[PDB]
């Protein structure tokens, strides 16, 4: 017998989102869709890059504006390394 994870009494299972068709497995497996993992400093404001052209290879300095102050962010793009975080998505197939 596998001791089956037992959920603590103060926790409840979160249902899937049927109102989420975006992170749906179907949407993510589309031939024109690519998934990217992004790591940033804790104080990084992603909105500062809105409309700006982030690189898909190499290293580039990208300028962002936050609260009126100009910030410049070095962006490094790479080939996924074996062992990287896997994205979980709701699947109708998985009940």
């Amino acid at each position: 017998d596998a001791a089956r994870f037992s959920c603590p009494p103060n926790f409840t299972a979160k249902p899937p989102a049927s109102e989420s068709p975006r992170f749906s497995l179907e949407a993510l497996t589309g031939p024109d869709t690519e998934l990217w993992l992004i790591q940033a400093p804790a104080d990084f404001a992603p909105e500062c890059f809105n409309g700006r052209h982030v690189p898909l290879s190499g290293s580039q300095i990208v300028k962002g504006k936050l609260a009126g102050k100009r910030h410049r962010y070095r962006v490094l793009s790479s080939c996924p390394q074996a062992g990287e975080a896997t994205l979980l998505a709701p699947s109708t197939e998985a009940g």
């Binding site: 993992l37 790591q39 400093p41 804790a42 104080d43 070095r74 490094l76 790479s78 390394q81 975080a85």
Partner: protein, 690 residues
């Protein structure tokens, strides 16, 4: 700055000035910055460090009759000196002018408020009077603080004095900065007398000297055994105990044996003797009986319970935590951080063993730091407070073991029964100089800790607050290699100022511009800034191969793995922050980046020290002209011109403040020392003090 307004050529029209005898409005400020390391250390030791010391102080629970009693020390406070009790009249204060006339100690009152409980629902806060602790002269707990030179003359004082000393029986003991290995940094060493520690030990090992908040120090050695296995030696109460690694790693972290392994093979994931010897550490001694964190803690608890002297009603799992808290990596609060630090020290023994790294000389100032008067004072205070608790409750358990219900009537009559202790023990360390402690305080020396400061001249006196003693044990050695004047003490120790007989090379003196760090800062927003700069947290996704990455450390805590092409820019950015006082980088953080090549050079990685006992020295930062402060280890990877026209474009990152910065204070009083032979400037330094 602090070296501006330095005279360009001497003058003689200051004597023969109409104001020669008028006592000045404020004290000199250049003479004050000589004993500054002796006073700013004590100021912490007695106010901000004493609270932290008492905060550790595990509550002393023990058994009375069929009852268990808990005693905790909530606060301890040292008061300025004062007339004993009120039995005296007309002036409560007590100024150092007396106790030199009379022959007595300038001692303040140390009192704490203990809190005794019976199971935690019955409690009362009593305020016991612990004893008397000596006081430094201008130390915030002294009566001559904040006095101008004119008011310092009506009390019979020098009008130009900087105390930095103690008056133990009116003798002015001058406890001097001893040399310690380092703090919170793993030093890889090749010492051949280590293979005698056991059957298969080798002459390789990384030592770490751990200090927590300046109240506790501990020495832990990771040894390499010929099998490829690593052992851990810890010392508790002057006894050496050997625990295979794996017992320690499994206890500290509730992780799988593959995740512990994936960590100790981070940079050498192609090597196969290592991959095989990591497994022989995890399986050979741990799959033999204990495979869950608790069973490891339980086994470790049973073997060590007898010599850790733990409470009898303590589960073995609780006695294991006691060993890890009090003996291994004192500096780190977390057990997860303590795991990552033991893993980087091992990853380093594997590189020293495979000849991929150079042994760190313990005798280079790169791998050395100083022990100030406040670290010795607090580290003795804390130990004596723990001893006081133990003795009061020895008396408790021994008196009657009798129905504490009504015995709450004599509880104070009980605590006072052993509160008669803390005074004379403290004066021995100061009047005699030698140390009587159950744990030697992670020191390695037990004598010559405090010395008489004699005012034969003002050049004998000023040299007691700038002396640095390599150690008192090295005065007895066949080989003379701790007497070599290596080129790494450039600007930090004077070449000429050394005693010229039996103490030669062992008693050095700081240059005029050198200084000890003594401030304590937050250093909490630094780990979150390093990540903005380009570091990737120890948790994962390095973005490269763990071999083309630098292991980032910050005061014993491994932030982790700045990329190899981002390490230079990160070091330069951090150096620009400290120089321009941006972010919260302390003006004195040492950003070190030991580059990595294929050669057996010192182990690579970006360190960042900000601890309170390193030596620093000013240098004019070129490209910014902003008077940076560099440390003993940070100075080996940078070019520092002396004269201008020696500055170049790519070379000469920095520049020195004055050309004679290298020489001590006394060696700067010898005229034209450049045209005399050197053994004669060493005799002049010793003759100007007689």
């Amino acid at each position: 700055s602090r070296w501006r307004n330095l005279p360009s050529g001497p003058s003689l029209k200051h004597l023969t000035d109409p104001s020669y005898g008028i006592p000045r409005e404020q004290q000199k400020a250049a003479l004050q910055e000589l004993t500054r390391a002796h006073v700013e250390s004590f100021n912490y030791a007695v106010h901000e460090g004493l609270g932290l010391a008492v905060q550790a102080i595990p509550p002393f629970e023990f058994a009375f009759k069929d009852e268990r009693i808990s005693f905790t020390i909530l606060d301890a406070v040292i008061s300025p000196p004062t007339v004993p009790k009120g039995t005296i009249c007309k002036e409560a204060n007590v100024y150092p002018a007396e106790c030199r006339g009379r022959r007595s100690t300038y001692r303040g009152k140390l009192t704490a408020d203990i809190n005794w409980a019976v199971n935690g629902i019955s409690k009362g806060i009593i305020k016991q009077f612990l004893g008397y602790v000596p006081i430094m002269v201008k130390s915030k707990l002294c009566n001559l603080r904040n006095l101008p030179p004119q008011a310092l003359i009506e009390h019979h004082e020098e009008a130009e004095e900087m105390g930095g000393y103690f008056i133990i029986n009116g003798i002015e003991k001058v406890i001097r900065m001893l040399i310690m290995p380092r703090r919170n940094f793993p030093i890889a060493m090749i010492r051949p007398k280590w293979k005698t520690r056991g059957p298969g030990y080798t002459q390789y090992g990384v030592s770490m000297h751990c200090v927590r908040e300046e109240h506790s120090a501990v020495n832990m050695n990771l040894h390499y055994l010929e099998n490829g296995t690593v052992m851990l030696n810890f010392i508790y109460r002057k006894e050496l105990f050997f625990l295979p690694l794996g017992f320690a790693l499994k206890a500290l972290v509730s992780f799988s044996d593959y995740q512990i392994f994936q960590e100790l093979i981070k940079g050498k994931e192609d090597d196969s003797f290592l991959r095989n010897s990591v497994s022989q550490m995890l399986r050979i001694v741990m799959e033999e009986g204990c495979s869950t964190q608790k069973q490891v803690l339980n086994y470790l608890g049973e073997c060590f319970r007898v010599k850790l002297n733990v409470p009898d009603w303590y589960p073995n799992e609780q006695a294991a935590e006691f060993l890890f808290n009090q003996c291994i990596c004192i500096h780190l609060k977390s057990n997860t951080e303590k795991f990552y630090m033991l893993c980087l020290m091992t990853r380093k023994l594997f590189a020293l063993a495979k000849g991929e790294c150079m042994e760190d000389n313990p005798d280079s100032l790169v791998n050395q730091e100083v022990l100030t008067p406040g670290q010795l004072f607090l580290m003795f205070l804390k130990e004596k407070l723990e001893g006081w608790l133990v003795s009061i409750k020895i008396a408790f358990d021994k008196k009657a073991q009798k129905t504490s219900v009504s015995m709450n009537t004599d509880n104070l009559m009980r605590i006072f029964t052993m509160g008669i202790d803390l005074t004379k023990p403290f004066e021995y360390l100061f009047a005699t100089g030698n140390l009587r402690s159950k744990t030697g305080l992670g020191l390695l020396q037990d004598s010559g800790l405090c010395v008489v400061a004699d005012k034969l001249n003002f050049i004998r006196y000023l040299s007691h607050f700038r002396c640095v003693h390599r150690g008192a044990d090295f005065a007895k050695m066949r080989t003379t290699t701790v007497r070599r004047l290596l080129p790494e003490s450039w600007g930090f120790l004077c070449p000429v100022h050394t005693p010229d007989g039996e103490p030669c090379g062992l008693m050095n003196h700081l240059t005029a511009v050198c200084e000890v760090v003594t401030q304590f800062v937050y250093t909490a927003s630094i780990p979150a800034l390093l990540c903005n700069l380009g570091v990737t947290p120890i948790d994962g996704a390095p973005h490269r191969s763990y071999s083309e990455c630098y292991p980032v450390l910050l005061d014993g805590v491994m932030v982790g793995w700045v990329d190899k092409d981002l390490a230079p820019g990160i070091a330069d950015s951090l150096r620009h922050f400290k120089v321009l006082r941006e972010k919260r980088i302390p003006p004195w953080m040492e950003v070190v980046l030991i580059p990595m090549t294929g050669k057996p050079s010192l182990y690579p990685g970006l360190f960042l020290f900000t601890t309170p006992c390193r030596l620093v020295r000013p240098v004019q930062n070129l490209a910014l002209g902003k008077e940076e402060l560099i440390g003993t280890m940070e100075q080996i990877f940078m070019n520092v011109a002396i004269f201008e026209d020696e500055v170049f474009a790519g070379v000469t990152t920095h520049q020195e403040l004055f050309p004679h910065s290298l020489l001590s204070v006394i060696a700067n009083f010898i005229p034209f020392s450049d045209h005399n032979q050197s053994p004669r400037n060493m005799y002049q330094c010793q003759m100007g003090k007689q």
